[PDB]
Every structure is written in structure tokens, then in C-alpha cells.
């Protein structure tokens with residue numbers, strides 16, 4: 001779809017078989033999801049944002065559906081203020097910014 | 100223009116008579132600019148993201164040119180690690196996310 005920006009660009013995702021709400025976030029390099037149980041191996045990592053750094057679990061090669069579009073890639077799981085879909089997955093679904 | 104998301108969606112902006120590079124950020128409600136000495140009145144604000152909150156100065160009705168497109172609106176200034184063009188100004192330049 002074409003998504004205008006008067007409202008937050010919130011979509012439904014499916015991850016680990018579970019539906020969640022997430023924000024399409026062109027300012028995020030990486031995808032960061034709130035704490036949840038997720039099948040797969042993970043590695044400890046840190047990620048920084050506007051306010052500093054947090055600890056996350058890095059899950060590689062996770063299947064995620066984003067507004068009906070399939071991606072398979074890295075998801076960081078940790079205490080984020082919001083579920084954010086970053087460029088690592090937005091590129092997989094063919095998203096571009098246009099003006 | 101169309102901006103793909105393989106790389107950070109950085110554009111040149113003009114604000115307070117200075118040129119800067121900034122992210123076109125669909126995940127940001129508001130525009131946040133790295134510390135700079137803007138004239139005029141402001142109001143304190145706190146904004147939160149990954150890692151917690153930062154203190155910023157909220158300036159209203161600030162003129163800002165974004166990739167050659169004029170805009171005017173609220174700009175938050177403070178110790179952000181990135182210049183962030185948020186939805187309050189993305190809408191003014193007619194930006195959409197498309198997939």
C-alpha cells in the first residue's frame with residue numbers, strides 16, 4: 001500500500017506465530033520487538049537509540065509477516081518502548097519513501 | 100523522489116540558516132535536531148525512545164527546508180545522536196511509505 005503519515009504507520013505483524021502491532025520505522029536500522037517468547041537460538045547484543053543503550057536478544061533468520069508481506073531476518077528482542085520494524089526488514093518487503 | 104532503504108534515508112535540511120543532514124523518519128512523531136543555538140522562545144520537553152528519555156527544547160513555527168521542500172512547524176532541539184525529521188514535517192512535504 002501507499003501509507004501517508006498523519007497517523008503513526010502501525011501495522012499488524014506475525015512473529016513466532018503470534019500477532020502483534022508494530023511501527024514501520026525508517027529511522028531504525030534494526031527491528032526491535034518487546035520481550036516475548038520466541039523460538040530460535042539467540043545471542044546477547046546491545047543496541048542504542050535516542051536515550052542510550054539497552055540489552056537485547058538477537059535472533060537471526062526469523063520469519064515475520066508484516067502487513068501481509070513476508071520477511072526473514074534479524075529481530076532484536078528487549079525492553080523497547082515500541083515494536084519497530086526497521087530497514088533490515090523494510091527493504092525485504094520492498095518499502096520505499098516517496099515525496 | 101524515491102528513497103530506497105538500503106542505507107539510512109538521509110537528506111540535506113536547512114534550519115536556522117545552517118545546512119545539516121537528517122533522517123526521514125516515519126517512526127518519529129516529532130522532529131528532533133542536534134543541539135544548536137536557535138533564537139526565540141521555547142518550552143521544555145522530554146522525549147523517550149530506546150534507552151530512555153532526553154531533555155529537549157520545543158520551538159514552534161520553525162522554518163525548515165527538507166531536500167528542497169519548505170516546511171514550518173515544531174522542532175525539538177537537544178542532545179540527540181541523530182537529526183530526525185518526524186511525521187509532523189514529513190506530512191508537509193508529502194512523504195509516503197510505499198510497498
Ligand SMILES: CC(C)CN(C[C@@H](O)[C@H](Cc1ccccc1)NC(=O)O[C@H]1CO[C@H]2OCC[C@H]21)S(=O)(=O)c1ccc(N)cc1
Nearest residue numbers: 027028029030048049050082126127129146147148149181
Ligand atoms: C523508537 C521509536 C519509536 C522512536 N524513535 C525514532 C526511531 O526511528 C529512532 C531514530 C534514531 C536514529 C538514530 C539514533 C537514535 C534514534 N531509531 C531507533 O531507535 O533505531 C534503533 C534501532 O535501529 C538502530 O538504528 C538507529 C538506532 C537504533 S526516537 O528517535 O526514539 C523518538 C522518540 C520520541 C520522539 N518524540 C521523537 C523521536
Ligand SMILES: [Cl-]
Nearest residue numbers: 171172173187
Ligand atoms: Cl506541527
